[PDB]
Amino acid sequence: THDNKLQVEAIKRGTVIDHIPAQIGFKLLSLFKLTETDQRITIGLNLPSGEMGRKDLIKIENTFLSEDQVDQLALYAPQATVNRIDNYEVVGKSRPSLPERIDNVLVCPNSNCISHAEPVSSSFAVRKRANDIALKCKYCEKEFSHNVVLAN
Amino acid sequence: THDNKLQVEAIKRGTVIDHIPAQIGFKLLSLFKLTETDQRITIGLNLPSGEMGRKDLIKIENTFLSEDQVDQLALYAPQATVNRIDNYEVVGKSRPSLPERIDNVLVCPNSNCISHAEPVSSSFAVRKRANDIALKCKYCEKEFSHNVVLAN
Amino acid sequence: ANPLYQKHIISINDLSRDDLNLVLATAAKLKANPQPELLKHKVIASCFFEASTRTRLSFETSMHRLGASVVGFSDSANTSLGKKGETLADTISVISTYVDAIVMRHPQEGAARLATEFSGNVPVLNAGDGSNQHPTQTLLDLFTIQETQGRLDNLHVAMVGDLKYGRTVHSLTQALAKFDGNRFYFIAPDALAMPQYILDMLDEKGIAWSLHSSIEEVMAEVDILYMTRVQKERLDPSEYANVKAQFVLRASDLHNAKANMKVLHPLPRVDEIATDVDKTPHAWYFQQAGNGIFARQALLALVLNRDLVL
Amino acid sequence: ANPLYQKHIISINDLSRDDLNLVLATAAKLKANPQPELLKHKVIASCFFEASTRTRLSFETSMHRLGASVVGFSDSANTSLGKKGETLADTISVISTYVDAIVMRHPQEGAARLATEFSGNVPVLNAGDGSNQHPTQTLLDLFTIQETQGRLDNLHVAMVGDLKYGRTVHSLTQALAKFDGNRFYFIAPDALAMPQYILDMLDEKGIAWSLHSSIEEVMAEVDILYMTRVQKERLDPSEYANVKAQFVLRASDLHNAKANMKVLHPLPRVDEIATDVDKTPHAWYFQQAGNGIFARQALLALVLNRDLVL
Amino acid sequence: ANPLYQKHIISINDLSRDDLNLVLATAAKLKANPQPELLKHKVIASCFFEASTRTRLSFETSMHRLGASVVGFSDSANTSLGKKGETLADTISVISTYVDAIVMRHPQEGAARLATEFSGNVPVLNAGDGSNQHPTQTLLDLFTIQETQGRLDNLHVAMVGDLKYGRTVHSLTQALAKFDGNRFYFIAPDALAMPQYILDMLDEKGIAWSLHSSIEEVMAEVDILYMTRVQKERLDPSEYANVKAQFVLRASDLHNAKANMKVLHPLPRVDEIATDVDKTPHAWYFQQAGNGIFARQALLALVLNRDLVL
Amino acid sequence: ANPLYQKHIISINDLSRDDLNLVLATAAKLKANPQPELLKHKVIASCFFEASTRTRLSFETSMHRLGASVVGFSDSANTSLGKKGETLADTISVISTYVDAIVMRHPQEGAARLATEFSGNVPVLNAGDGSNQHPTQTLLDLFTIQETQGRLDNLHVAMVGDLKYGRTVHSLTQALAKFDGNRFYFIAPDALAMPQYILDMLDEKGIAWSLHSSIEEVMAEVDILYMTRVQKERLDPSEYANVKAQFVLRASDLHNAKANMKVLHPLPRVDEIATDVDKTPHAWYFQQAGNGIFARQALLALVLNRDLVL
Numbered sequence A, B: 001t002h003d004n005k006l007q008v009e010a011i012k013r014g015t016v017i018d019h020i021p022a023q024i025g026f027k028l029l030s031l032f033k034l035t036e037t038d039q040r041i042t043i044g045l046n047l048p049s050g051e052m053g054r055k056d057l058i059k060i061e062n063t064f065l066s067e068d069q070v071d072q073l074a075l076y077a078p079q080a081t082v083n084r085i086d087n088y089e090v091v092g093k094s095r096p097s098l099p100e101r102i103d104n105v106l107v108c109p110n111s112n113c114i115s116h117a118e119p120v121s122s123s124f125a126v127r128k129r130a131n132d133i134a135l136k137c138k139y140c141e142k143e144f145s146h147n148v149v150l151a152n
Numbered sequence C, D, E, F: 001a002n003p004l005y006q007k008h009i010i011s012i013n014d015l016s017r018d019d020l021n022l023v024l025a026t027a028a029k030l031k032a033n034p035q036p037e038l039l040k041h042k043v044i045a046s047c048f049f050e051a052s053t054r055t056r057l058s059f060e061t062s063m064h065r066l067g068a069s070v071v072g073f074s075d076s077a078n079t080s081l082g083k084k085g086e087t088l089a090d091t092i093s094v095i096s097t098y099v100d101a102i103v104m105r106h107p108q109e110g111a112a113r114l115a116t117e118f119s120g121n122v123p124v125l126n127a128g129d130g131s132n133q134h135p136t137q138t139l140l141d142l143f144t145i146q147e148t149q150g151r152l153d154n155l156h157v158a159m160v161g162d163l164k165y166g167r168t169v170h171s172l173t174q175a176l177a178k179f180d181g182n183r184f185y186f187i188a189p190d191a192l193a194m195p196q197y198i199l200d201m202l203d204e205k206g207i208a209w210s211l212h213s214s215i216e217e218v219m220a221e222v223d224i225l226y227m228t229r230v231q232k233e234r235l236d237p238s239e240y241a242n243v244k245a246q247f248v249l250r251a252s253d254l255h256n257a258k259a260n261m262k263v264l265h266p267l268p269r270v271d272e273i274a275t276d277v278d279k280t281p282h283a284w285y286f287q288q289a290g291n292g293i294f295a296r297q298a299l300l301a302l303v304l305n306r307d308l309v310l
């Protein structure tokens, strides 16, 4: 999607997280500590998109994401489009695939899980199923619907 | 408005915070929830100021800041400027003045303070002591160096 | 004398529709026109074999607002009368020679009815007996429903939480069932569903009730949303986590609610009602708690004052 | 109405010199001419989340001496409202629908100020909140100083013991600092010295204060020798032994004392005041405790009686 | 080296059918041919953060039967290594620099798994982690079934009691589901039914299972009747009474039992198996417990020795 | 016989520089060449009148590594050998007729010393006696320093945290003060400063020491950065917060640390060492703990065997 009003300049080498379903942008930036870098960053919050009404967009420079770091966006911005860029050209363009493992960012719902009081990173096996994603904690081995885990 | 030699963007109406120090931009959008608003927000981080080298910058559409809200910005980013932009022309360039009362964003360092387990908003008393601003909790009436309070 | 004069108050099932109405009308009157000397010179025993600060204070405040004197005790972690040695029977036999009425809470079902057989002419009011009855909580709930809805008939009432074990929702149901046209909506996790005997009771009376997964299914048509605490120990931590959402309330869940709808909760809430609900015109759990004093005053007045000069 | 009518009483810092004087004058009047029916029909909650038999009894006696009714509880080793589950906020929200005022002591700093935000029109008097404030102890101390010295200005005051952690000596200092010409003498082991912020406060007000190793250095010129308990757990047993002498009093230490000098101690003493001091005209810790009832009565009177007919 | 050499034993879901047969084959050998010196010079930590006398004595005995030394602790109302402050991660990083293997039981799910992340090269054996796993109980149960039935395939297995909360039956069902042609009979109050997730796992592998109101309906065909303890503390006294009746096993119920049939119970029993069952040839719960020794010895030997010349 | 044969190990002040080198030399040998049978047939008592899991497990493991058997107890809320009545002297006169050596920890200073007066010929090893000594912790600390630095002379040693109350840092300072050219850096809140008596001891031997506000000031030159736990329970919550900040160690602070530099901590840590420090080459607190095994084995071997053919 373009903007015949005010378009944000491109860059040589970096990545572009387009189609961010607005009000998920900043979250992506929090959850994944995307701002904990010196590289040039450019955010676009709540913007015009003919293919979904409104959408956020993040641009990080001299920084790329493996197919996995991109898959990690799955649960938040599934229809996003990660754009690999170099010499001002969109040399790469991948979409978030549901990963088989999600680490560090989720918090286990089980208040009795050992993960809470301890110096370890949360970790969940991802399993897709009709209507939701089943997430099973590495520690307590309990499985929860992603709506419960992501549940604010 | 953010130009060098290519595409540039600007907002119709809304406010615009400029010259935020190193990685305080994300923190300000964090603390003060500057992105909770579903207006056309746009952020720049680690931007090339030249007159420093780097800095962050924000901008909200259809949103205005009172000289008050503009004050809470003094502890993390002293010198800067918020700008109301009605009719594509900044009709106001103010400055964040150190306030007397900082609410909701600080966490009292006294672990025994009644503020922790309760449905109340934090509240401190601002009082600089030869550069080492002291913070006094409204509840436990204890006072700490802003270095201790902000640490967490 | 009035119908409740010198009567015991053990179970909501022993109270008629008229009785319930007499208590509520009396409670309305005391709220409007206080009578601080009504039970002057009466001495009441506040016996909490099972501690319950909220309930004990409510009750003792009601004794004082009528001017009665109070003697008592809380939590019987032992007690040399009613648990570790002496039978409850002997404890009451002794206590009934000292006071004018006994208010008591006990961890065992039937405790208040048993006291009744040893208290002679001394009335006993049940402040809670195990998982059996809690009469005054229900009188306070009904007075609260009647005052904010203008009536106790043809109401749409939703009950949420631990419908299985909550003695309070069981009694409120029975009491509301003595009135006509009340429609019930039961929202609870399957492991904590409203008991079959309550459902059967309702079927015989021909009262309508249905089951629902969550509040939103019925939010737009309820007059009273009665929330209950889901005791965390009941469930397995993970089980509790997988199901609690369907049984907690936030203010954003209130967009459909009728302007007249009030949210009640016998308290403590904490895990089931977010504090953002506090500021809405629907929150009425604190006003409900406040009504406990008027319902409890009514009851002491009626049972201890032969001719209730209303 | 009087200046303190329906006002909260949380911190000595929120009380002005005039306020302090109004309480003391009111306290003098009640001591002289009792008014046992003044708060007749008022119901006060005596809420000791943190137990304190001496302080609770003092306060409840003051409620009764004015004729108010009392409901409450002590030590919350659990409590189903204000610690283990329910927030303090909800506990007060409920309690404020039952009583006319709340007197409360809590182990956490700021507890009383927090209650104030949920008690609506119900005044809250702070009976102690962690290591923060203890307003009524200071009012009782000042009334005691004013009555035995004829004034609260130009006094020579020595404070001894744990000046570091004693919330009581911190408040007395602040209160006495609102008056003029008071001179302070701080006698404490280095590990328990009067805090720097208290000293700084005094410097700005231009109040004179000095540090001393022991009582005898200043004994001949003090009007009030305020002793405090040095909590044995604070120090290491051997550390405690090497330093306690400098902070305990025997009657033989009184040979220099001015005829007008009184020894105060918020109690318990035991490790700091020998019992031979008891018979001297200087011992005034028990009369001080007795004054707690007149100061506490004054406070309840002022906050609950619109027009204090003194 | 054997496939279990230096491996952690945390969950039944991590063990394969061959792993299980390897443990049971080693168990029969050690049972037939003891190696009281196999682990001489090895020191093992018996860490029961959660006290469990029966499991600890069983595990410690197994340790000694192989010649190893033991050091450890139980509960945490006595212990000063985590009672309040130090993380389990640090407690493990320390202990693993002392011992050759850690046996641990803990109240939170996942604790054993967290331990393997901090024990470096020291094997961690899970003696129970909250409501998650208890792998050695499952190994002992399977050793007992294999030993009395001669196989782990094509068995009729009935499970009775609290199937909802018993971590032991969930585990045994998962383990048995790794073999072929097994058929399950679940007999439990609806309030304590075998969880849907276990039933899903079964349907998914084409394993037959069916619910039944009484043992009576399955007795003629059962090979293993596995009884569980009913977690009364979870239910209502009245509730627990109302159903317990149909999940209690009496000697007369074994009337038509097959000759090979065995009654198991992880213990302790109390109201699920009448004492008269003890004398029948079918009672095998005490023999089951004695087998924990051979199962646990096997697991220790396999994990600490590369090749067992057993 | 070796110089430590049949000697009691009660205080670091009783050990000479040669004693210390002898213990550390034996430790390196047992670490390199284990003698799992050296003490076979010896029975040792592990008497923790004061519970201490980490120290007991460490000490018991060392016992087993040399082949000795162990008997003992922990805490005294369970024990029936002194809980209220029998003297420590009698408890020792009895136990010393059973065992070959006594390892003991006690809450009162001097308990180990008192024990040697009643144990006849049975060596007493002090695992801690109130705030006085903890000699084996000092030996393990010194073994770790010697092992990572190759010497105990001419070292730059920084000590951080609560230097006032830590019996462990006082002891280590005294022990190191027995060697030459060591220089000390003390970094602690003034409220928890290294005691004057230790500073006097140092001045007296011409040992250089200096106070510093932050680790930052010493990092470039430190060989051993010894962190202690801050006894929070002693301070004020507000106080502990106000200073803890400058005595917490983070991975980024090790920026300019020498290659040989090691961070030690007797443990448990929590708020003094961030977890990110654990992965750096400097974190040696868990290696320090594992060395308690070799230090304690050495001490037992030296005391129970005349000549070690190590």
Ligand SMILES: Nc1ccn([C@@H]2O[C@H](COP(=O)(O)OP(=O)(O)OP(=O)(O)O)[C@@H](O)[C@H]2O)c(=O)n1
Binding pocket: A001, A008, A009, A010, A011, A012, A016, A018, A019, A057, A059, A081, A083, A085, A088, A089, A090
């Ligand atoms: N140097 C560059 C190159 C590309 N982009 C961004 O990368 C995304 C690529 O968009 P485009 O290639 O034109 O494909 P679309 O039309 O956007 O369709 P889609 O959004 O699915 O990719 C846009 O946000 C574009 O602005 C950029 O910011 N700077």
Ligand SMILES: Nc1ccn([C@@H]2O[C@H](COP(=O)(O)OP(=O)(O)OP(=O)(O)O)[C@@H](O)[C@H]2O)c(=O)n1
Binding pocket: B001, B002, B009, B010, B011, B012, B016, B018, B059, B081, B083, B085, B088, B089, B090, B093
């Ligand atoms: N419609 C507009 C107009 C202005 N701006 C922003 O307003 C900020 C400040 O511009 P201005 O104060 O008018 O001139 P400056 O050069 O920024 O003054 P200074 O040197 O103090 O920054 C710039 O980021 C500009 O992009 C904007 O975002 N949208």
Ligand SMILES: [Zn+2]
Binding pocket: A108, A109, A110, A113, A114, A115, A137, A138, A139, A140, A141, A142, E110
């Ligand atoms: Zn988990």
Ligand SMILES: [Zn+2]
Binding pocket: B108, B109, B110, B113, B114, B115, B137, B138, B139, B140, B141, B142, D110
């Ligand atoms: Zn505070």
